[PDB]
């Protein structure tokens, strides 16, 4: 019935921040607790790359050459381009739309590592987010570890100002939205919990301890958008990701904000 009820049924710890951008009403659960963000940080990474390209417009064109030993687990796009390289823009699209892990590392090598993503977060008003590690270690999702964590509220605030606000200049804002709307690997999470008429731009995350996340912006066809951040993590190290918990949380959040 409710987020608290969903959590009790699924087990684990569920964090939600949903914001109706027309009224500021929210649907919340553990919204100020830290969670391991896993691949949802790739939305921030893309934003940080886009922001660096504002003073250096050629950044998105730069070609990155990497080798077999640079590939980490789950690299479905980059593993096809070991012999050609990829541009920074192509790496952004791969990491956001397919969650490619090597693409994230290659982008962070270009822009100054975990510290550069964290500094970017601070620059848009997020004093909570911390990126400490690289792919795939940042997905360990250990109970009680603050590395590679944020709160549902901080990530919802970031999405609001990046997608619906003026944190990025308009051209870069449009590109971030295009990338997020093009997510190919999230159909069973937030996208499964909204009507097929609503449009979604989102980034999923998955990690150890059955960590299952999805953050994004929801555009209903005839009402203002809703910003939704959902984080979920479990007690046992070998727990299985639960896509359906994210879809169910999305149904509750959308109904609260109806």
- What CATH number has the domain bearing residue 212? 3.40.710.10
Burial 167-198 (b: 16+ CB within 10 A, else e): bbeeebbebbbebbbebebbebbbbbbbeeeb
Facing residues of 141 across strands?
Answer: none
For the beta carbon of residue 100, count every other beta carbon within 10 angstroms: 29
Cα dist from 29 to 5, 34, 42, 150, 210, whole Å = 11, 12, 23, 14, 19
Q: Token pair of 48, please?
A: 């940080």
Whether the Cβ atoms of residue 171 and residue 199 lie closer than 8 Å to each other:
no
CB proximity list for 258: less than 8 A, separation 6 or greater = none
Instruction: Write the DSSP assignment of 30-98 as a string of letters.
Output: STTS-EE-GGGHHHHHHHHHHHHHHH-TTGGG-EE---GGG--S--TTGGG-TTT-EEHHHHHHHHHHS
**Max Cα separation, the chain?**
52
Parallel, antiparallel or unpaired: strands 13-20 and 226-233: antiparallel
Domain range for residue 61?
1-258
Our CA dihedral for 177, 203, 246, 122, rounded to 10 degrees, sits at -90
Separation between Cα atoms, residue 218 and residue 199, nearest integer Å:
6
For the beta carbon of residue 53, count every other beta carbon within 10 angstroms: 23
Separation between Cα atoms, residue 158 and residue 238, nearest integer Å:
31
For the beta carbon of residue 31, count every other beta carbon within 10 angstroms: 21
Parallel, antiparallel or unpaired: strands 86-87 and 26-29: unpaired
Resolution (A): 1.2
Our CA dihedral for 199, 241, 89, 137, rounded to 10 degrees, sits at 150
Q: Token pair of 63, please?
A: 């070609």
Domain count, the chain: 1
Q: Give counts: helices (H), strands (E), the chain.
A: 8, 9
Radius of gyration of the chain (CA): 17
Give yes or no: 39 in active site. yes
Helices (H), 98-242: 101-111, 113-123, 152-159, 170-181
CB proximity list for 251: less than 8 A, separation 6 or greater = 193
Whether the Cβ atoms of residue 61 and residue 85 lie closer than 8 Å to each other:
no
Whether the Cβ atoms of residue 227 and residue 18 lie closer than 8 Å to each other:
yes
Task: Classify the phi-psi angles of 15: left when phi > 0, otherwise alpha if psi is within -120 to 50, otherwise beta.
Answer: beta
Catalytic residue among 39, 53, 99, 254: 39
- 70 by Cβ neighbours in 10 Å (0-12 / 13-18 / 19+) ranks as middle
| Structure-solving method | X-ray
Whether the Cβ atoms of residue 230 and residue 28 lie closer than 8 Å to each other:
no
Cα dist from 209 to 11, 138, 221, 224, 237, whole Å = 12, 13, 36, 35, 4
């Amino acid at each position: 019935a409710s987020f608290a009820a969903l959590e009790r049924a699924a087990g684990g710890r569920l964090g939600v921040c949903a914001i109706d951008t027309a009224t500021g009403r929210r649907a919340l659960h553990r919204a100020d607790e830290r969670f391991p963000f896993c691949s949802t940080f790739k939305a921030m990474l893309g934003a940080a790359v886009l922001a660096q390209s504002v003073a250096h417009p050629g950044l998105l064109q730069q070609r990155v050459t990497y080798g077999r030993s640079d590939l980490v687990n789950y690299s479905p796009v980059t593993e096809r381009h070991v012999d050609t390289g990829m541009t920074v823009a192509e790496l952004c699209a791969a990491t956001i739309q397919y969650s490619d892990n090597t693409a994230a590392n290659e982008l962070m090598k270009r822009i100054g590592g975990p510290a550069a993503v964290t500094a970017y977060a601070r620059s848009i008003g997020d004093d909570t987010f911390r990126l400490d590690r690289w792919e795939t270690e940042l997905n360990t999702a250990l109970p009680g570890d603050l590395r590679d964590t944020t709160t549902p509220a901080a990530m919802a605030a970031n999405l609001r100002v990046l997608v619906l606000g003026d944190a990025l200049p308009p051209a870069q804002r449009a590109q971030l939205i295009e990338w997020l709307r093009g997510n190919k690997v999230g159909d069973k999470r937030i996208r499964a919990g909204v009507p097929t008429g609503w449009r979604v731009g989102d980034k999923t995350g998955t990690g150890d301890y059955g960590t299952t996340n999805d953050v994004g912006v929801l555009w209903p066809p005839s009402r203002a958008p809703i910003v939704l951040a959902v984080y979920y993590t479990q007690t046992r190290a070998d727990a299985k990701a639960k896509d359906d918990v994210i879809a169910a949380a999305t149904r509750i959040a959308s109904a609260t904000l109806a």
